[PDB]
Ligand binder design. Structure first.
Ligand code: NA
Lengths: 66, 66, 66
């Protein structure tokens, strides 16, 4: 709900996920959300955006055991 | 509404609603939000963006059932 | 907190806060959310963005009244 949308907002503003991947984060399962979040954080690292990586990982942490 | 915010997020990132219309989605009635979402989906369709149209329509459907 | 993410989305759309500040708005307490939202509204007003400014103001008020 709110946590998947947090992930969505941060990942979209980072430009780290494609349209399909964002669609899956919004309409898919929680496991898919966790996996795309991990990919998003790694991509945020790769762009030099350490802050976004830290935010995405904290959100994924909330998303995980849930 | 978390779903109204989903509509807000997707429509803003796609450019499917104008600034005023996004404001209306947040501060307007539920019917106004649904109708602006449908307009956003129709505009995305008109531009050929089927992906955005499919997501917007799913969100609007959730808005209707609530 | 649907309202905290609502505040986050609107404050991010203005470009008034840095990535760190947005991180605090999303992952911090409600008090930090109120203070950074007020900062975002003040900066947006200063940049000429009325609509964003007291949309944020209404949001911060909702956040404060629990
Ligand atoms: Na079409």
């Amino acid at each position: 709900g709110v946590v998947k949308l947090e992930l969505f907002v941060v990942a979209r503003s980072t430009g780290a996920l494609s349209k399909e991947e964002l669609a899956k984060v919004m309409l898919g399962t929680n496991e898919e959300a966790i996996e795309l979040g991990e990919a998003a954080a790694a991509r945020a690292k790769a762009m030099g955006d350490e802050e976004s990586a830290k935010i995405i990982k904290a959100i994924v942490e909330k998303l995980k055991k849930g």
